[PDB]
Write an enzyme that holds these catalytic residues in place. Structure first.
Site, PDB file in Angstrom:
ATOM      1  N   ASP A   6       0.835  -1.189   0.000  1.00 38.94           N
ATOM      2  CA  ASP A   6       0.000   0.000   0.000  1.00 38.94           C
ATOM      3  C   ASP A   6       0.868   1.236   0.000  1.00 38.94           C
ATOM      4  O   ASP A   6       1.337   1.664   1.046  1.00 38.94           O
ATOM      5  CB  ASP A   6      -0.882   0.028   1.230  1.00 38.94           C
ATOM      6  N   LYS A  68       2.201  11.528  -3.823  1.00 42.19           N
ATOM      7  CA  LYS A  68       1.200  10.747  -4.516  1.00 42.19           C
ATOM      8  C   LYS A  68       0.140  11.631  -5.143  1.00 42.19           C
ATOM      9  O   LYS A  68      -0.620  11.177  -5.979  1.00 42.19           O
ATOM     10  CB  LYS A  68       0.584   9.732  -3.557  1.00 42.19           C
ATOM     11  N   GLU A 169      -7.579   0.424  -4.277  1.00 40.65           N
ATOM     12  CA  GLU A 169      -7.500   0.378  -2.833  1.00 40.65           C
ATOM     13  C   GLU A 169      -8.816  -0.071  -2.230  1.00 40.65           C
ATOM     14  O   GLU A 169      -8.853  -0.966  -1.398  1.00 40.65           O
ATOM     15  CB  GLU A 169      -7.109   1.753  -2.306  1.00 40.65           C
ATOM     16  N   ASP A 191     -12.823   5.853   3.209  1.00 44.11           N
ATOM     17  CA  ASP A 191     -11.402   5.924   3.495  1.00 44.11           C
ATOM     18  C   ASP A 191     -10.950   7.331   3.802  1.00 44.11           C
ATOM     19  O   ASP A 191     -10.965   8.204   2.941  1.00 44.11           O
ATOM     20  CB  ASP A 191     -10.588   5.345   2.349  1.00 44.11           C
TER      21      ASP A 191
HETATM   22 NA    NA Z   1      -3.695   7.028   0.611  1.00 46.50          NA
END
Ligand code: NA
Length: 374
Positions: A6, A68, A169, A191
């Protein structure tokens, strides 16, 4: 054996399949998670993970975080021109026109930084395996495009990993919860990570996953709570002593570390103490401060609300209704916060599932997927 990684906006985790269960692997610091932070000290030394994290506030211009957000992205992308406004470090457009980062005259691509993070994960996983890791499954947000998925895939190669597959994810987390063999079931995935918030509505039919809707906020996460708490602490200190800390990074570095600690406390307790001796110098001034849950909740009430509207849009765009959702699983460490759990319940109309560790579920799912391939 195939590694599942991850690669997170703020934190990364690595797990591998040991038998019939996925085993999350802990770094040389005994932590099961690693900050996705990379920094270059003035001399030119490179730091990765916690080391970089503990310097993030004193060395802002040279510390790379939330990269990211830039990976696989063009420079003139609104998401990049927005990020520039919210981060202190320098973002510059490469020869491609791709979004890059610069520090001390040396410039790096988002994939390179990701590679620095993935390298430590690789190291961490190899200690366990004994041999070297070659094959990996890395996770990406459902909202990622090809350009972003390739750049993530490329980052893995730099670190020396053959990325066999890139799975979403939200889908990965669903694997961690055993929903792999569901006949028909609609799942909502909430999330709330260190850096981004994601709401994704999934449907599984005869074991085939479909992402029906996706919404969220790229600039709302756990770190935002810490900062709001830091401002509150800083402001409360000026009142009581008349000292303003805003200009002292060495102290602010401590407050952030302290704000990060208080937050964790208040998910298991209703009160904690902020104790920071010799924060400044008519003599030393010690920071002693009491924070209660109700206070904290009040301080970050707006951070939480901001989740409510994207989740409503998600169900709309997915043409669903609370009754239709069969399960809700929580992902992100910020989901440990009770008020987040309650806002999540009276949103989808059900108690959230919390069986799987919020911030290891994706890494675990990535492991499951990798075990399948081996
Ligand atoms: Na993330």
């Amino acid at each position: 054996a195939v590694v599942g990684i991850d690669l997170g906006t703020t934190n990364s985790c690595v797990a591998v399949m040991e038998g019939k269960q996925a085993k999350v692997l802990e770094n040389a610091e005994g932590a099961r998670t690693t900050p996705s932070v990379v920094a270059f000290t003035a001399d030119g030394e490179r730091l990765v993970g916690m080391p970089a994290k503990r310097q993030a506030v004193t060395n802002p211009n040279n510390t790379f975080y939330a990269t990211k957000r830039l990976i696989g992205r063009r420079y003139d992308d609104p998401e990049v021109q927005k990020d520039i406004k919210n981060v202190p470090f320098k973002i510059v457009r490469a020869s491609n026109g791709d979004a890059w980062v610069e520090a001390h005259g040396k410039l790096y691509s988002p994939s390179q930084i990701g590679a620095f993070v993935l390298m430590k994960m690789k190291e961490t996983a190899e200690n366990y395996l004994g041999h070297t890791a070659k094959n990996a499954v890395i996770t990406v947000p459902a909202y990622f495009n090809d350009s972003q998925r390739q750049a993530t895939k490329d980052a893995g190669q730099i670190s020396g990993l053959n990325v066999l597959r890139v799975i979403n994810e939200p889908t990965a987390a669903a694997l961690a919860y055993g929903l792999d063999k569901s006949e028909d079931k609609v799942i909502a995935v909430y999330d709330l990570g260190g850096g981004t918030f994601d709401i994704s509505i999934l449907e599984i039919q005869k074991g085939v996953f479909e992402v029906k809707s996706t919404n969220g906020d790229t600039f709302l996460g756990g770190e935002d709570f810490d900062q709001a708490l830091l401002r509150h602490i800083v402001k409360e200190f000026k009142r009581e002593t008349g000292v303003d800390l805003t200009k002292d990074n060495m102290a602010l570095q401590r407050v952030r570390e302290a704000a990060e600690k208080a937050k964790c406390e208040l998910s298991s307790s209703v009160q904690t103490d902020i104790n920071l001796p010799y924060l400044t110098m008519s003599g030393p001034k010690h920071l002693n401060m009491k924070l209660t849950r109700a206070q904290f909740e009040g301080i970050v009430t707006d951070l939480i609300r901001r989740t409510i509207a994207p989740c409503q849009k998600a169900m709309q765009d997915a043409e669903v209704s609370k009754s239709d959702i069969g399960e809700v699983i929580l992902v992100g460490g910020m989901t440990r916060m009770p008020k987040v759990q309650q806002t999540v319940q009276d949103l989808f109309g059900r108690a959230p599932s919390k069986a799987v560790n919020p911030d290891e579920a994706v890494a675990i799912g990535a492991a499951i997927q990798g075990g399948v391939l081996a």
